[PDB]
Design an enzyme around this catalytic site. Structure first.
Site, PDB file in Angstrom:
ATOM      1  N   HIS A 103      75.669  16.437  24.184  1.00  0.00           N
ATOM      2  CA  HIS A 103      74.574  17.735  24.734  1.00  0.00           C
ATOM      3  C   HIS A 103      73.161  17.932  24.704  1.00  0.00           C
ATOM      4  CE1 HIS A 103      78.610  20.757  25.814  1.00  0.00           C
ATOM      5  NE2 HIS A 103      78.041  19.142  26.627  1.00  0.00           N
TER       6      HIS A 103
ATOM      7  N   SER B  70      73.865  14.319  30.349  1.00  0.00           N
ATOM      8  CA  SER B  70      74.897  12.725  31.381  1.00  0.00           C
ATOM      9  C   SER B  70      73.689  11.918  31.337  1.00  0.00           C
ATOM     10  CB  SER B  70      75.601  13.884  32.460  1.00  0.00           C
ATOM     11  OG  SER B  70      76.855  14.242  31.220  1.00  0.00           O
TER      12      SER B  70
ATOM     13  N   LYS C  12      85.124  19.853  40.918  1.00  0.00           N
ATOM     14  CA  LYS C  12      85.148  18.092  40.629  1.00  0.00           C
ATOM     15  C   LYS C  12      86.404  17.128  39.319  1.00  0.00           C
ATOM     16  CE  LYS C  12      82.471  14.312  40.521  1.00  0.00           C
ATOM     17  NZ  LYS C  12      82.846  13.259  42.289  1.00  0.00           N
ATOM     18  N   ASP C  13      86.115  18.053  38.599  1.00  0.00           N
ATOM     19  CA  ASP C  13      87.387  17.670  37.160  1.00  0.00           C
ATOM     20  C   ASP C  13      89.285  18.372  37.628  1.00  0.00           C
ATOM     21  OD1 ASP C  13      84.985  17.484  34.551  1.00  0.00           O
ATOM     22  OD2 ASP C  13      84.588  16.330  36.441  1.00  0.00           O
TER      23      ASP C  13
ATOM     24  N   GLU D  72     102.939  -2.120  23.128  1.00  0.00           N
ATOM     25  CA  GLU D  72     102.919  -1.278  24.371  1.00  0.00           C
ATOM     26  C   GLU D  72     101.923  -2.077  24.874  1.00  0.00           C
ATOM     27  OE1 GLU D  72     104.170   1.832  26.108  1.00  0.00           O
ATOM     28  OE2 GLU D  72     105.709   1.567  24.206  1.00  0.00           O
TER      29      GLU D  72
HETATM   30  C1  HEM Z   1      89.787  10.906  22.588  1.00  0.00           C
HETATM   31  C2  HEM Z   1      88.677  10.503  23.746  1.00  0.00           C
HETATM   32  C3  HEM Z   1      87.388  11.296  24.097  1.00  0.00           C
HETATM   33  C4  HEM Z   1      86.904  12.079  24.648  1.00  0.00           C
HETATM   34  C5  HEM Z   1      88.017  12.858  24.403  1.00  0.00           C
HETATM   35  C6  HEM Z   1      85.990  11.613  25.363  1.00  0.00           C
HETATM   36  C7  HEM Z   1      84.314  13.118  25.838  1.00  0.00           C
HETATM   37  C8  HEM Z   1      84.184  12.448  26.806  1.00  0.00           C
HETATM   38  C9  HEM Z   1      83.529  13.697  27.128  1.00  0.00           C
HETATM   39  C10 HEM Z   1      84.120  15.150  27.863  1.00  0.00           C
HETATM   40  C11 HEM Z   1      82.285  12.994  28.053  1.00  0.00           C
HETATM   41  C12 HEM Z   1      81.652  13.654  29.017  1.00  0.00           C
HETATM   42  C13 HEM Z   1      81.733  13.189  30.955  1.00  0.00           C
HETATM   43  C14 HEM Z   1      82.347  12.145  30.325  1.00  0.00           C
HETATM   44  O1  HEM Z   1      80.827  11.527  30.604  1.00  0.00           O
HETATM   45  O2  HEM Z   1      82.800  11.126  30.799  1.00  0.00           O
HETATM   46  C15 HEM Z   1      82.087  12.150  27.573  1.00  0.00           C
HETATM   47  C16 HEM Z   1      80.432  10.897  27.952  1.00  0.00           C
HETATM   48  C17 HEM Z   1      80.619   9.848  27.003  1.00  0.00           C
HETATM   49  N1  HEM Z   1      81.766   9.579  26.143  1.00  0.00           N
HETATM   50 FE1  HEM Z   1      83.316  10.252  25.329  1.00  0.00          FE
HETATM   51  N2  HEM Z   1      85.548  11.080  24.556  1.00  0.00           N
HETATM   52  C18 HEM Z   1      86.411  10.207  24.495  1.00  0.00           C
HETATM   53  C19 HEM Z   1      85.662   8.519  23.924  1.00  0.00           C
HETATM   54  C20 HEM Z   1      85.154   7.959  24.117  1.00  0.00           C
HETATM   55  C21 HEM Z   1      85.376   6.071  23.491  1.00  0.00           C
HETATM   56  C22 HEM Z   1      85.495   5.615  23.821  1.00  0.00           C
HETATM   57  C23 HEM Z   1      83.360   5.972  23.610  1.00  0.00           C
HETATM   58  C24 HEM Z   1      83.230   4.546  24.175  1.00  0.00           C
HETATM   59  C25 HEM Z   1      83.322   3.978  23.599  1.00  0.00           C
HETATM   60  C26 HEM Z   1      82.973   7.186  24.753  1.00  0.00           C
HETATM   61  C27 HEM Z   1      81.747   6.807  24.927  1.00  0.00           C
HETATM   62  C28 HEM Z   1      81.576   8.448  25.636  1.00  0.00           C
HETATM   63  C29 HEM Z   1      79.739   7.860  26.331  1.00  0.00           C
HETATM   64  C30 HEM Z   1      78.659   7.371  25.660  1.00  0.00           C
HETATM   65  C31 HEM Z   1      79.631   8.525  27.081  1.00  0.00           C
HETATM   66  C32 HEM Z   1      77.888   9.101  27.808  1.00  0.00           C
HETATM   67  C33 HEM Z   1      78.817   9.332  29.383  1.00  0.00           C
HETATM   68  C34 HEM Z   1      76.936   9.373  30.488  1.00  0.00           C
HETATM   69  O3  HEM Z   1      77.085   8.116  30.657  1.00  0.00           O
HETATM   70  O4  HEM Z   1      76.575  10.276  30.876  1.00  0.00           O
HETATM   71  N3  HEM Z   1      83.801   8.634  24.093  1.00  0.00           N
HETATM   72  N4  HEM Z   1      83.300  12.186  26.744  1.00  0.00           N
HETATM   73  C1  JZV Z   2     103.995   0.803  14.447  1.00  0.00           C
HETATM   74  O1  JZV Z   2     103.357  -0.623  15.773  1.00  0.00           O
HETATM   75  N1  JZV Z   2     103.235  -0.087  17.150  1.00  0.00           N
HETATM   76  C2  JZV Z   2     102.977  -0.938  17.316  1.00  0.00           C
HETATM   77  C3  JZV Z   2     102.973  -0.199  19.620  1.00  0.00           C
HETATM   78  O2  JZV Z   2     103.239  -0.550  20.026  1.00  0.00           O
HETATM   79  O3  JZV Z   2     102.650   0.984  19.195  1.00  0.00           O
HETATM   80  C4  JZV Z   2     102.321   1.933  20.458  1.00  0.00           C
HETATM   81  C5  JZV Z   2     104.105  -2.291  18.181  1.00  0.00           C
HETATM   82  C6  JZV Z   2     104.563  -2.520  18.922  1.00  0.00           C
HETATM   83  C7  JZV Z   2     104.678  -3.854  18.858  1.00  0.00           C
HETATM   84  C8  JZV Z   2     104.237  -4.682  17.797  1.00  0.00           C
HETATM   85  C9  JZV Z   2     102.514  -3.893  17.377  1.00  0.00           C
HETATM   86  C10 JZV Z   2     102.766  -3.054  17.228  1.00  0.00           C
HETATM   87  C11 JZV Z   2     101.253  -2.682  16.617  1.00  0.00           C
HETATM   88  O4  JZV Z   2     100.155  -2.442  17.792  1.00  0.00           O
HETATM   89  N2  JZV Z   2      99.816  -3.608  17.630  1.00  0.00           N
HETATM   90  C12 JZV Z   2      97.793  -3.980  17.634  1.00  0.00           C
HETATM   91  C13 JZV Z   2      98.027  -5.297  17.835  1.00  0.00           C
HETATM   92  C14 JZV Z   2      97.569  -2.919  17.085  1.00  0.00           C
HETATM   93  C15 JZV Z   2      95.886  -3.791  17.663  1.00  0.00           C
HETATM   94  C16 JZV Z   2      94.526  -2.748  17.115  1.00  0.00           C
HETATM   95  C17 JZV Z   2      94.852  -2.194  16.755  1.00  0.00           C
HETATM   96  C18 JZV Z   2      95.949  -1.549  16.162  1.00  0.00           C
HETATM   97  C19 JZV Z   2      96.138  -0.553  15.088  1.00  0.00           C
HETATM   98  F1  JZV Z   2      96.861  -0.346  14.146  1.00  0.00           F
HETATM   99  F2  JZV Z   2      96.858   0.914  15.817  1.00  0.00           F
HETATM  100  F3  JZV Z   2      94.844   0.999  14.752  1.00  0.00           F
HETATM  101  C20 JZV Z   2      96.902  -2.273  16.792  1.00  0.00           C
END
Ligand code: HEM
Ligand code: JZV
Ligand code: PEE
Ligand code: PEE
Ligand code: HEC
Ligand code: HEM
Ligand code: HEM
Ligand code: BOG
Ligand code: BOG
Ligand code: BOG
Lengths: 59, 79, 241, 101, 49, 67, 379, 55, 54
Positions: free
Chosen positions: G201, G205, G227-228, G271
């Site tokens: 915020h 966005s 939209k969402d 998985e």
């Molecule tokens: C539990 C995981 C997450 C939640 C609940 C979350 C939630 C949100 C929400 C609600 C927004 C606003 C709407 C949208 O642009 O999609 C947002 C934006 C954003 N999130 Fe996440 N997010 C998550 C994970 C992440 C991850 C893993 C990344 C990047 C590694 C990330 C990067 C961003 C960025 C950079 C924006 C900016 C969007 C734009 O360009 O306007 N978020 N996120």
């Molecule tokens: C407890 O193991 N849970 C497994 C699974 O499928 O959960 C959905 C699983 C199953 C078979 C082989 C390896 C994994 C373990 O997950 N494997 C990898 C290779 C992994 C890769 C990056 C990060 C992480 C962690 F640690 F969650 F952060 C885990």
């Protein structure tokens, strides 16, 4: 004109709109379930216990 | 507070209609679809290629893996 | 030892996303299990009451459970004792523990069948191909004593002797007890044992789809309706110029 | 040389911002330097950039583009900001260099 | 001057009943709102279910 | 006596161009493997190709003749 | 203040982030994943609690408690399905969320990006410990395989591991601490998600054209709330279709077998959502090197903000980057695929190719092509 | 409904554990809201008169 | 801990008897609940006496 009648009677005042949703849902449920179940059983004639039950149902 | 401090803007006029005066999904065939096609066209050659390559590599590797499980008669011609 | 035969896809009557189990087939499958498989195979997660309203009558289920003696207790003197079964009891275990089970099957352990069709790739198609797939080993292959050849079992040497053959039992519903008919029934039964929710799950799937179709369309119109204001919006640049 | 002088015209058309009626400089990510440059643009250039950009955003939401006739042509693209931006950066580099000294 | 400004034509988007510039748009207003609101009320019923 | 539709369809299917060919390769393998005294070879692969073709065929028809 | 939506210390918060919140007028469907991720999170927590109320963290009862839940609890089978499959919906959404960010330079909002990376890491840890709970064969062996990797860290190796297990192998003490961790982490995710949105915020966005949208902003409601909501039902359909018609499509049948430490399954694989990383793990034959590779495969995300060379924010007007982008996406499907395959030829060599190209594209090619494109624009 | 049966038994125990694990987090949450409202006014003091003259 | 009628009591006992400092943690948790309430009651009292409730 139903759309106008609807609008005037149901959708205009927010109170009646909510009343229409509730009363609408009650009726939708009763109908939608009966139909779904009806469809499901027809698609599975004689496979459900409801169907074969009579064969062993006899004290 | 975020509405009113955004940008210095001058001389732009905009016209819009209530949603009840217009159609929700207008000109599906005259405007919508053509554009859908337009959009698909402009992207297909950027997206498709690598996915196609992926598929190939996939098919190869899968078949090659099974072929290596089969036996080569050339190991039993002697006996 | 490398290479494995993958079963074929039989057209089960419960395969369609909207197709329930043929309960008549499940009932017979139960009989197979009860009279054949239950001799060496435990089914720990199912109880006689589970049959009620599915394949059997309440009276029928109560009788089925009473054919079994279960160990209850302790009593007043802290003694274990036998008693006739109730519908709340689970299908009886053939052996006290795995050690005793292997002891009676040449060191082989017949696994619990409660989840078998989900614990094996292929599911019922696998179990079915296996039961009806016993045959002589091909040239060059020798099955060590005690094991039986089955092309569908990994390694192809299974420790289970062909369990079923024609007329090995009689269906009291009058169905011709051929070997494949039996396997088909017990497999349908195994599906149900693995997931009793099967039918309800699909009935729900149907309702999910209809509502999902209806609701998604409705919401699409609403989104479009609101956005029409921006979609049709027109603008112009009019500098004093 | 006039070799990539063609490549450019190619890339320019590959990029496609001209389909939105945008100038190359209209598409610049507004980091610090760019922000300063924009403050220096004369009123008229600034408002023209504004309309162009707002216009593009509206096309983008509509999922449309300008008719082929209205696309900016490679050779008619105005590098209206590049001059200011080049200055802003020298000034910065001057100060940076001077503050180490 | 502003006198030179006019609203572009929205015929490509107007709903059928308000397409004609010489007809009162009020007569069809309960119709246009009744429909859209009907869609909405139905979504609520579908959701409440 | 009773007859298992399975065995019946197994036969009808083995009388298929596909099976007949697979079945043929198998018998050849079986023959040479059985006639030696220091070979590794086995006829699993050949038996599998046969069973796969046969059983795939059986699937298409078997459940039709079952209750 | 006139309306109570602005004055009130709480509604004011609800209003400045979900109603009067200024949003670009042109953000696409790719911006719908943030909200789905949130809703997804609320749902996992909800179904999670419902399951937790019938689970028993003990090696001797875990498996059967899950079975008792699916067989006896009213709709327990449904809740179990939704929770397990919900984990996948969660990852699909999170990967598209990330993808959108890389493609549109959302990572330039550094803090929003870094918290995001942290959310992903936490989400993985959550799913890892969660998976162990049913105590099936893949539950146990997956736990074993991964946790054993840390004994490879020199010195603090055997220690860190025996500390984590609470013994000499994955056993009951591990299961109980994993249950506590699984119950706990989702709440950290919810917390961090708030920080995520707070940094966000600050700027508001970004949008698909990558240029300032101050000239054209619209209120989050009703535009995006609608939209969402639409985006929710659109995704939710395939989710439910899968969970109701093909419940076990994504799961390993090996987990329908009580864990047994005296029987190693033939193919220990995770998985789907972990496969890509599992592939990279095995690409480096050398316990320690593979572990670092695995770690780097995700930690690499923290570098993205520093590898932006383009003069433009998004990839909308950068065709060379666009293909590189999709090359990368395909690169990932390949790794996912290699991950599900045994460690043999030709999968082995293909695997290292895919692992190597993965890091190259993000570390070397993207920044390079970006610079190259700057020149082609005479910049 | 609360017991999950006809008396306090295992089903009650397992849901109570879940609740016990959970509620403390709600307390932490609500505590933030508590302090948020509080900061609107700032602390009161033992004499009950405005302390703006001496903070 | 193990939430099961057949293991709860002993899991707490196992904690106090086998876990390193489990006995200490258990004490601090049980007694901490009281520190919590003593504090909450003085907090409230203060509020009633000083009109913080306003
Ligand atoms: C539990 C995981 C997450 C939640 C609940 C979350 C939630 C949100 C929400 C609600 C927004 C606003 C709407 C949208 O642009 O999609 C947002 C934006 C954003 N999130 Fe996440 N997010 C998550 C994970 C992440 C991850 C893993 C990344 C990047 C590694 C990330 C990067 C961003 C960025 C950079 C924006 C900016 C969007 C734009 O360009 O306007 N978020 N996120
Ligand atoms: C407890 O193991 N849970 C497994 C699974 O499928 O959960 C959905 C699983 C199953 C078979 C082989 C390896 C994994 C373990 O997950 N494997 C990898 C290779 C992994 C890769 C990056 C990060 C992480 C962690 F640690 F969650 F952060 C885990
Ligand atoms: C048997 C069941 C009977 C009992 C059920 C009780 C439920 C009844 C609910 C009360 C009725 C709602 C009243 C709404 C009135 C407010 C209103 O303005 O309408 C909503 C208003 C519309 O605005 P206008 O079109 O401008 O209307 C102007 C009217 N002159 O906002 C909306 O769009 C809401 C309707 C869309 C709902 C979208 C929900 C999508 C969710 C789908 C997933 C499924 C649900 C799962 C729930 C998870 C629970 C753990
Ligand atoms: C990561 C874990 C790996 C798991 C597998 C990855 C997921 C595989 C599913 C494939 C993705 C389906 C998407 C197909 C949609 C094709 C499409 O629409 O592309 C064209 C379109 C054109 O957009 P503009 O240039 O703005 O045009 C404006 C003018 N008209 O491009 C887009 O929509 C933007 C792309 C964003 C979505 C990316 C989704 C892929 C997700 C993968 C994550 C990868 C990133 C890094 C993760 C490392 C960990
Ligand atoms: C004499 C006891 C006995 C009978 C009766 C018997 N089985 Fe088995 N079954 C076994 C044994 C022993 C194994 C273990 C095989 C092995 O692992 O080598 C086994 C294994 C199995 C397996 C597959 C194991 C795997 O790894 O794929 C299935 C499925 C199976 N039996 C089904 C049945 C069914 C259905 C019936 C009744 C039609 C049945 N069995 C009757 C002894 C028996
Ligand atoms: C970030 C959200 C969550 C994710 C990603 C997640 C993921 C998982 C995964 C992958 C499993 C294994 C499912 C299976 O195959 O059986 C699982 C199981 C479980 N989760 Fe979660 N979970 C989440 C939140 C929670 C929460 C908040 C709770 C409850 C406090 C919870 C309780 C459980 C329980 C009891 C199980 C065991 C029963 C089962 O396996 O179905 N989970 N979770
Ligand atoms: C988990 C419980 C609670 C936490 C963590 C908490 C925390 C706080 C904190 C940190 C303050 C500021 C310092 C102070 O004046 O003591 C505060 C003030 C206050 N709290 Fe709480 N509180 C709790 C429970 C309650 C309860 C039960 C009440 C009343 C029923 C309450 C009423 C107040 C009020 C009215 C103030 C104003 C103090 C003043 O007059 O300046 N709090 N609380
Ligand atoms: C098929 O049996 C079903 O079992 C369900 C158990 O969850 C019940 O709720 C359904 O009413 C019943 O029809
Ligand atoms: C996208 C929204 C999907 C919601 C789908 C709701 C359908 C759930 O419907 C369920 O069907 C079962 C089988 O008949 C019944 O036993 C349950 O009582 C009923 O609630
Ligand atoms: O980001 C937002 O920032 C606001 C202002 O700090 C908070 O009130 C909201 O809760 C938060 O979600």
């Amino acid at each position: 004109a139903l759309l106008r009648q609807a609008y005037s009677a149901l959708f205009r005042r927010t109170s009646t709109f909510a009343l229409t949703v509730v009363l609408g849902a009650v009726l939708f449920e009763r109908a939608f379930d009966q139909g779904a179940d009806a469809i499901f059983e027809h698609l599975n004639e004689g496979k459900l216990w409801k169907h074969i039950k009579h064969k062993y149902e006899a004290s | 507070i975020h509405f009113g401090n955004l940008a210095r803007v001058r001389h732009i006029i905009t016209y819009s209609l209530s949603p009840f005066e217009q159609r929700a999904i207008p000109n599906i065939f005259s405007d919508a679809l053509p554009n859908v096609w337009r959009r698909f066209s402009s992207q297909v050659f950027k997206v498709a290629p690598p996915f196609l390559g992926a598929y190939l590599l996939y098919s190869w590797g899968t078949q090659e893996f099974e072929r290596l499980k089969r036996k080569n008669p050339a190991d039993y011609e002697n006996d | 030892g490398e290479l494995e035969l993958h079963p074929p896809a039989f057209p089960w009557s419960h395969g369609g996303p909207l197709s329930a189990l043929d309960h008549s087939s499940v009932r017979r499958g139960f009989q197979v299990y009860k009279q054949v498989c239950s001799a060496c195979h435990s089914m720990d997660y199912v109880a006689f009451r589970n049959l009620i309203g599915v394949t059997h009558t309440e009276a029928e289920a109560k009788a089925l459970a009473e054919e079994v003696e279960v160990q209850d207790g302790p009593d007043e003197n802290g003694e274990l004792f036998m008693r006739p079964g109730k519908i709340s009891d689970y299908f009886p275990k053939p052996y006290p523990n795995p050690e005793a089970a292997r002891a009676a099957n040449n060191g082989a352990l017949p696994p619990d069948l409660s989840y078998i069709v989900n614990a094996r790739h292929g599911g019922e198609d696998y179990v079915f191909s296996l039961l009806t797939g016993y045959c002589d080993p091909p040239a060059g292959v020798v099955v060590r004593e005690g094991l039986h050849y089955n092309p569908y079992f990994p390694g192809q040497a299974i420790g289970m002797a062909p369990p079923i053959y024609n007329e090995i039992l009689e269906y009291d519903d009058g169905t011709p007890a051929t070997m494949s008919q039996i396997a088909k029934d017990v497999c349908t039964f195994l599906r149900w044992a693995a997931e009793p929710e099967h039918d309800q799950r699909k009935r729900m799937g149907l309702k999910m789809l209809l509502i999902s179709a209806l609701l998604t369309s409705l919401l699409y119109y609403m989104k479009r309706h609101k956005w029409s204001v921006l979609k049709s919006r027109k603008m112009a640049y009019r500098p004093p110029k | 040389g006039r070799l990539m002088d063609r490549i450019r015209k190619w890339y320019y058309n590959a990029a496609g911002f001209n389909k939105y009626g945008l100038m190359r400089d209209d598409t610049l990510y507004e980091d610090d330097d760019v922000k300063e440059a924009l403050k220096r643009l004369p009123e008229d250039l600034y408002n023209e950039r504004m309309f162009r950009i707002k216009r593009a955003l509206d096309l983008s939401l509509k999922h449309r583009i300008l008719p082929k006739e209205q696309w900016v042509k490679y050779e008619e693209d105005k590098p209206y900001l590049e001059p200011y931006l080049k200055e802003v950066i020298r000034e910065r580099l001057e100060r940076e260099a001077w503050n180490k000294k | 001057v502003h006198n030179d400004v006019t609203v572009p034509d929205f015929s490509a988007y107007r709903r059928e009943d308000v397409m004609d510039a010489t007809t009162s748009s009020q007569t069809s207003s309960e119709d246009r709102k009744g429909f859209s609101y009907l869609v909405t009320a139905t979504a609520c019923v579908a959701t409440a279910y | 006596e009773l007859v298992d539709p399975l065995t019946t369809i197994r036969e009808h299917c083995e009388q298929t161009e596909k099976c007949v060919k697979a079945r043929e390769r198998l018998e050849l393998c079986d023959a040479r493997v059985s006639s030696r005294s220091h070979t590794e070879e086995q006829c699993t692969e050949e038996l599998f190709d046969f069973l796969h073709a046969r059983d795939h065929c059986v699937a298409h028809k078997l459940f039709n003749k079952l209750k | 203040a006139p309306n109570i939506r602005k004055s009130h210390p709480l509604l004011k918060m609800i209003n400045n982030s979900l109603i009067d919140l200024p949003a670009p007028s042109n953000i696409s469907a790719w911006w719908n994943f943030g909200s789905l991720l949130a809703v997804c999170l609320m749902t996992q927590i909800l179904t999670g609690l419902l399951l937790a109320m019938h689970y028993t963290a003990d090696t001797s009862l875990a498996f059967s408690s899950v079975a008792h839940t699916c067989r006896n609890v009213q709709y327990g089978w449904l809740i179990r399905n939704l929770h397990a499959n919900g984990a996948s919906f969660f990852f699909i959404c999170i990967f598209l969320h990330i993808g959108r960010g890389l493609y549109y330079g959302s990572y330039l909002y550094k803090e929003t990006w870094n918290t995001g990376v942290i959310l992903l890491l936490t989400l993985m840890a959550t799913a890892f410990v969660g998976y162990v709970l049913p105590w099936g064969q893949m539950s146990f062996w997956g736990a074993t395989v991964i946790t054993n990797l840390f004994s490879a860290i020199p010195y603090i190796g055997h220690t860190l591991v025996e500390w984590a297990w609470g013994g000499f192998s994955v056993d009951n003490p591990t299961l109980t601490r994993f249950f506590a961790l699984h119950f706990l982490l989702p709440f950290a995710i919810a917390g961090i998600t708030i920080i995520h949105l707070t940094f966000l915020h600050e700027s508001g966005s970004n949008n698909p054209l990558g240029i300032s949208s101050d000239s054209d902003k619209i209120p989050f409601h009703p535009y995006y709330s609608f939209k969402d909501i639409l985006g929710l039902t659109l995704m939710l359909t395939p989710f439910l279709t899968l969970a109701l018609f093909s419940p076990n499509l994504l799961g390993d049948p090996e987990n329908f077998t009580p864990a047994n430490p005296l029987v190693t399954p033939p193919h220990i694989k995770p998985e789907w959502y972990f496969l890509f990383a599992y592939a990279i793990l095995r690409s480096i034959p050398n316990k320690l090197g593979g572990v670092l590779a695995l770690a780097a495969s995700v930690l690499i995300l923290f570098l993205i903000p520093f590898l932006h060379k383009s003069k433009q924010r998004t990839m909308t007007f950068r065709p060379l980057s666009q293909t590189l982008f999709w090359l990368l996406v395909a690169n990932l499907l390949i790794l996912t695929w290699i991950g599900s395959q045994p460690v043999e030829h030709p999968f082995i060599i293909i695997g290292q190719m895919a692992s190597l190209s993965y890091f190259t594209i993000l570390l070397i090619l993207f920044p390079t092509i970006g610079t190259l494109e700057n020149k082609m624009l005479n910049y």
